[PDB]
Amino acid sequence: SLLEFGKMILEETGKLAIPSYSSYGCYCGWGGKGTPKDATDRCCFVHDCCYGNLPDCNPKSDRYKYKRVNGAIVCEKGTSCENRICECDKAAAICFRQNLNTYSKKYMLYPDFLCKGELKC
Numbered sequence: 001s002l003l004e005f006g007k008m009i010l011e012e013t014g015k016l017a018i019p020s021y022s023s024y025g026c027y028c029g030w031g032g033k034g035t036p037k038d039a040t041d042r043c044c045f046v047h048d049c050c051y052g053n054l055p056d057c058n059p060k061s062d063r064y065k066y067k068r069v070n071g072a073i074v075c076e077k078g079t080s081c082e083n084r085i086c087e088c089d090k091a092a093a094i095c096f097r098q099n100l101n102t103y104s105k106k107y108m109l110y111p112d113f114l115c116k117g118e119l120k121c
């Protein structure tokens, strides 16, 4: 669920899920349309695509359990939806951590009209 994801982001990046990643680019937080603005925006695009592969699960509200083995994120055995959601977030977190160095504030609160373009998962 989102309680898990946000906690994961903070631990990983140090920035806070909301508002650092709840309204960035064209995909973080708001999904929909567009061409991802930057690397962090691409993690969101890929992440949204990740939840999209799980039709009958509830990413936002189904809680899962994960642990750290010296820094590694280890998703714990749960329902199979819980296992797959967890993997989807673990990636976003890793991806987020990987492009902290290019996280740019001008994409914060990014306006919608500026997000039109085509991208299939």
Ligand SMILES: CC(C)NC[C@@H](O)COc1ccc(CC(N)=O)cc1
Pocket (backbone or CB within 6 Å): 002, 018, 022, 028, 029, 047, 048, 060
């Ligand atoms: C505590 C506050 C009010 N949070 C409400 C909460 O709905 C914030 O919302 C969201 C909505 C959707 C997502 C999708 C995720 N990033 O992939 C992440 C966070």
